[PDB]
Amino acid sequence: SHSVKIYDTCIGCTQCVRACPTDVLEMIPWGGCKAKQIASAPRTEDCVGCKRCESACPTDFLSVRVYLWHETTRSMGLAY
Amino acid sequence: MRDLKTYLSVAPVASTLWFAALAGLLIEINRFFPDALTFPFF
Amino acid sequence: ASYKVKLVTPDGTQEFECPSDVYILDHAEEVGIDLPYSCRAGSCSSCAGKVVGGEVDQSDGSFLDDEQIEAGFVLTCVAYPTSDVVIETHKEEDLTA
Amino acid sequence: YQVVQPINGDPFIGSLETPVTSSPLVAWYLSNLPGYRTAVNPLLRGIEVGLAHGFLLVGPFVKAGPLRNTEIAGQAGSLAAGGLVVILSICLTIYGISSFNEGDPSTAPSLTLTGRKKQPDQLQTADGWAKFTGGFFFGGISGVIWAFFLLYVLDLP
């Protein structure tokens, strides 16, 4: 299972959650930004590691990060 | 006509003209002073 | 130049003056009619809105459908108001569908 | 009318039905082969296997090997086929060793083509696979021996 971490520079634009192809991410309420929103990653046992979320984040530097880690059946994307 | 003057200054055309003129200049120099290995003047 | 802007909003409809070389959002920032934004960079849908009249410069707009700029929606933070416009605010989800 | 149908009416299994995979002649034939005789002792099936394949593997090693024209050594090249039988039965043994354990049931399917339960095919055991291994190997070496026994001139020696 890969690791996905959210950092407090997040502006809560939700662009990363819209992009995930396996539904790893989620929005949760917060108080540190104008959107009162922050991303979370509750379901990292399904993450294929495509970094489609990182291409979508606009902050500099990134607010979502994907660290590739130990591989499994779901992580490798095997249908057999 | 002004648009043509602008277009003629776009990068590929400008470089094309610049280098064609430079080529003519070096070609004519070498046609006048052929086979130069040194500066034979001073 | 500095055409008058009109923004329907749950707070009401207010006008402010502001030159054409500017983005709408910082100009509603000037006079102080609060609007919703997240990015300020044209890469999300929080500053979304649609138009009542005229049309707004969307040259430096991105992350939009090859249509979102031909059937009404606009991002307020990357938009130049070429005319005396009349626009909508808080328009993300009926854009989000 | 159409000829290709989803496998047993289920159109979401990754296969199809054709005149190649589900045809009465092909079905009956493939059914009456050793590997598909589920209700039979593993060793008998293995015997059929080893017989047929030693006999088949005789020919090529003889008619193509390095001493094909030297016939003070041309015919006795059945040594080679015996060695090949030995090697792939060693491979059978290590495959069965790694794929199974005696204290575990046989992984074969328990359902049949119509939805009735079957007693799982015992060839997929550890025990019965070792039995089938012995059968195949016995058959292979003695089939090499048999097709070397027929050295009498026929049409092409």
Next chain:
Amino acid sequence: VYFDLEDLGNTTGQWDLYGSDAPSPYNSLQSKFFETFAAPFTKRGLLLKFLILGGGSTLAYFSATASGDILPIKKGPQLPPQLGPRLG
């Protein structure tokens, strides 16, 4: 409708498409013979160690005592050797 939580194997397709489950067609005099004589080669460790060491035995044997008609490596050279570009 091909989804039944009770029977899972029919939903995921665990059929034997070519198995038979018919009685033995090799009448017992023939089967009798084979399963009598072909038994001692039916243990895993037994068969493996025996096969390995017997194959090695036959290979070392037939390798140490192969004749010249077989292997030119054995018949040796039959000619006087040349000299190299200088040496030899």
Next chain:
Amino acid sequence: FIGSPTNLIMVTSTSLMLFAGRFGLAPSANRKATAGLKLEARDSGLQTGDPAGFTLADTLACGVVGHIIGVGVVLGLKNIG
């Protein structure tokens, strides 16, 4: 050329093909053959005056066909006997 030689052959060939095309028995401008078995009806829009709906396009087509078929069998018969 006219007398009793190629004349007879080609004339009767093109004449029978025109006679076919005018009446039924043959695909035509107002007749659409389905698969070589039977013919349907169709008003091509092109106006004619012949009572059987015989267009000039139809006449041209069947005339060309008569000439092709006559040239064929003439050359055959005069190449074999």
Next chain:
Amino acid sequence: WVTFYWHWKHITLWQGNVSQFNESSTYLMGWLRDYLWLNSSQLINGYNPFGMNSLSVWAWMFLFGHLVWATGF
């Protein structure tokens, strides 16, 4: 580059033909023709339709190296 330099210089010196290197080394066609092509004949004749000699193992190996290399691509 280094070992090509060393080997060409030395092979022309060992043959008493130093002028060959001194004349052909100043343009790259010289390196291609007078070093690579010229010194390849015996190796590639190691085996041929008319027989083999003791260079055979190198003629074979030469080709092995060309194969492995290409598989790396």
Next chain:
Amino acid sequence: PEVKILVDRDPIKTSFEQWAKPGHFSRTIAKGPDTTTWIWNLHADAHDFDSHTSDLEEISRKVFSAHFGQLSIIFLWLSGMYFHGARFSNYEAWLNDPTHIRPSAQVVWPIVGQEILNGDVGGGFRGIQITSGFFQIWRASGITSELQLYCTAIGALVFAALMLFAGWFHYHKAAPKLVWFQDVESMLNHHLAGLLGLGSLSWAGHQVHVSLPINQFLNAGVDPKEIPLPHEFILNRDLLAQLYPSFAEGATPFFTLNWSKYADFLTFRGGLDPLTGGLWLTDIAHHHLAIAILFLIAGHMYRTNWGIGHGIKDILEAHKGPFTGQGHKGLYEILTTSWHAQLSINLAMLGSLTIIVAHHMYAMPPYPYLATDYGTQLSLFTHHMWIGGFLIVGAAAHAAIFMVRDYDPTTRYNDLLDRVLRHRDAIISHLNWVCIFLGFHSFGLYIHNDTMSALGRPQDMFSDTAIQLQPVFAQWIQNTHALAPGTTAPGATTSTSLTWGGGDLVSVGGKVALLPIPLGTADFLVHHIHAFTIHVTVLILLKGVLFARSSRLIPDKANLGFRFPCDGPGRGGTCQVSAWDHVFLGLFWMYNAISVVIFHFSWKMQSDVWGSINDQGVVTHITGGNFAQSSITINGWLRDFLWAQASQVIQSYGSSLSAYGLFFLGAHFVWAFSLMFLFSGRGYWQELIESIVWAHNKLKVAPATQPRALSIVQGRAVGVTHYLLGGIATTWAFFLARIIAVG
């Protein structure tokens, strides 16, 4: 329903304002550059019409006028060829003695010593020997003076200006609408009966009146200046009736149906002309007559406006059976709404046609004095093989584009496409297997042979002397083609080609034009190598097409486009899943297959076909005939073909062939230069550009359009482009230097 002209007036206005605003076509480029990446995108998307807009009418208008532009360019290139033949050539002297003067239509100025490239090509002339075979065409045309070449150069220039004007006109003033383009029945009727029928009829006419008599006079020995002008043959007809008595009756037979009386100049001979080494002109004229008749009839199949004809939809809907469901229903709607489907079919057919042209033109030489001009024959075969391969690969590219951007079962459903999509797994499985099996049994034989030849065991080889693999069917077929004239073709005298056999050999000027080509074990091995390479190329391209929309690995691939780098390093890594990457990979394998094809043909022709014959009649081939015994190992290809024939090009420094020696080395350089783009990635390059940019910033000399490294896809594309250029140019220099040097 009915067919008519449909046009709009003044759709776009001629202006310069859009020239000064780069990237007007795409909204993203129009905005202007921030980084250098912009400049690349501007060129990559320049002709992607259906991506600049959504409207089919606009795409078709653009395509039509772009075609006019291409035709104008081709006419300008033809104008140049004819003008250079007229002005800077030795064509007249070559016309006087064709088997001694080697053709040349390009001279160079004496600027830096380069005048050494003006070599002695014979006839009091010094220049560059050409290999396009234009002199042979101009002789087969009847051209005998440079004034006719001037005239055709001027006519081609006029036609080029005309094409350019029509290109402007149909886009800016009279632009046809979509319903005009979408009428395929009338289009096919015109191209079948009007372009190809009338074209070859008119050409048969020219051969009957100009080429045939002027070539009769030339082969009789008459001085090329004392031959009458062509138009004389038309004014005075007794001139024609002297050479062909049948021209006295003059169209009375063609009506009296006694076509027999034309047997004078419309023959069915077969074989070559033993004076010039080409096909009989009396055969070619008769051929063109027959082809024109066939096409003129075939251009009357489809219904346009008068009922009679065939509806394409009806034909397609009629075909279906119990294995294919409803097949062909729904292909007319597809083949009339996507340009990419049409382009794929058209590219496939044109590439295959070009390869067939290569084979037929070597085997039955059409022009006079072409068969003994070895350099021209090699050049033509090789050129056309390369063109065919490239077009076939483009076919796959545009099939993939159709699958990603246009296929849509919601509004245009076809059954056959759906069924192929539903068993693509089995398809790709079986093709994969057959390529592995074919690769083991052809290259493996070579490896066996090399190892048996190096182990001092030649009696264990796969060859004509030890273990024979004779292609029985090929030998059987060419034996049937040998016995054909007189038995299954009573109307023919000689058989179609001299390669079939019969013991007939044709010579010209002491050179060998043609003779029977022998098939043996080596031919068997080479052909199975060829089957292997073609199967592999097909596997790669078809895998790219069939899985362009989705996979078990990436189930929504169509949403990422047709040309994307990857879908990230996850799932194990997904570099090069797009169909563009499959085209990129298939280009290398096409290069491999075509290269082996041209090597096989080049070695075989010199070894068993080309050479010199003696008055006593003993043929000495260019190479000694060593293809039968040295082609069966890899060492024989490296030794007896590459090393032994590169001698001509590595020894051209100082001669007039030294340009080939320079291009040999330049092409090696460009090839090795591409490996840098192919083996690396852009992260390294952007990080190096960072430090270089720092250095520029230190001196207030840093540019405002921020420099970036190339794209991932651009890196791949630059790599394959330089790889292909380097390799093909190396073989070009090798071939031309070698063939020109020996002869």
